[PDB]
Design a protein around this ligand. Structure first.
Ligand SMILES: *[C@H]1OC[C@@H](O[C@@H]2OC[C@@H](O)[C@H](O)[C@H]2O)[C@H](O)[C@H]1F
Length: 309
């Protein structure tokens, strides 16, 4: 057994990660907790398209590198997030369409991945391409309007740019196996694997709340995607009200699935969360461990004994 999340996860060859905000790296309580508890880091916003390429071909990795450096100097690996997404595009990219956009998408992938070549264990190459609801359709965005092949092209571009990284497709509201959105993502990944499109992993954002509750069939979802020959990862976990029960169920679902690489919770303390009003994380505002922390740690350890091995 181990006393911190990341170390406990590593006992089963997994990671327990967080989302780090560069602006919070001067907060010693934040860095003390994050450094102690997590062995994987995702930049909360610093590696997104707007932050890394604020003007066309004018890359900026200052804040991204502050997060990367903090992570590897503190022994954590890094998940890159995210290279091609409808949201958080800089204005110059939002105004592009068709072939111009396609070239800018490929150029953006190449510039960011070249900066981090060989440094990133997993990249969220494409994020949130499916529409919400029951259509199973692709979300309408400039990227989807440039051609349905944009997702496959992003993955091929990424594989060429850095063949050492695992390349993931990431989305939300795809955790419950009965949902149409889940099945659309499953059909796409299944097609990609059939044809040899370079995709190594599927990310489940895992934002559970009253509008999209956890279901025990999340384990079925994870198993079925793993059976397509891809790894699975829980990438942006947070749970409205932070019930320790549900946090432990999610943890045990990953631990039950051999290709589930690890879990990332989407921030450190509740005050750090993008949805702080839903108090959805493992640590209180004062840095203290919540009931959910204990249940997650115990799940990772397979129990809480205090005795000789
Ligand atoms: C999964 O959901 C969380 C999202 O990160 C938020 O993006 C919007 C930004 O205002 C917040 O600070 C971030 O926490 C992440 O990119 C997405 F993939």
């Amino acid at each position: 057994a181990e006393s911190t999340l990341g170390a406990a996860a590593a006992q089963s060859g997994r990671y327990f990660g967080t989302a780090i905000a560069s602006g919070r790296l001067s907060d010693s309580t934040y860095t003390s907790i994050a450094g102690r508890e997590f062995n994987m880091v995702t930049a909360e916003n610093e590696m997104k398209i707007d932050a890394t390429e604020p003007q066309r071909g004018q890359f900026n990795f200052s804040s991204a590198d502050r997060v990367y450096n903090w992570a590897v100097q503190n022994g954590k690996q890094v998940r890159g997030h995210t290279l091609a997404w409808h949201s958080q595009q800089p204005g110059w990219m939002q105004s592009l369409s068709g072939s111009a956009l396609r070239q800018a998408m490929i150029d953006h992938i190449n510039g960011v991945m070249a900066h981090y070549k060989g440094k990133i264990v997993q990249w969220d190459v494409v994020n949130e391409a499916f529409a919400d609801g029951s259509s199973g359709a692709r979300r309408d965005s400039n990227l989807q309007r440039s051609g349905n092949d944009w997702i496959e092209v992003a993955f091929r571009t990424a594989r060429a740019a850095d063949p050492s990284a695992k390349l993931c497709y990431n989305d939300y509201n795809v955790e419950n196996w009965t949902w149409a959105k889940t099945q659309a993502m499953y059909n796409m990944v299944r097609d990609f694997k059939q044809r040899g499109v370079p995709i190594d992993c599927v990310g489940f954002q895992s934002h559970f709340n009253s509008g999209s509750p956890y279901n025990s069939n999340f384990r079925t979802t994870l198993q079925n995607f793993a059976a397509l020959g891809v790894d699975v990862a829980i990438t942006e976990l947070d749970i409205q009200g932070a019930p320790a029960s549900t946090y432990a169920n999610v943890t045990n679902d990953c631990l039950a699935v051999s290709r589930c690489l690890g879990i990332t919770v989407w921030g450190v303390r509740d005050s750090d969360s993008w949805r702080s009003e839903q108090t959805p994380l493992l640590f209180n505002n004062d840095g203290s461990k919540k009931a959910a922390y204990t249940a997650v740690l115990d799940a990772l350890n397979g129990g809480d004994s205090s005795e000789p091995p």
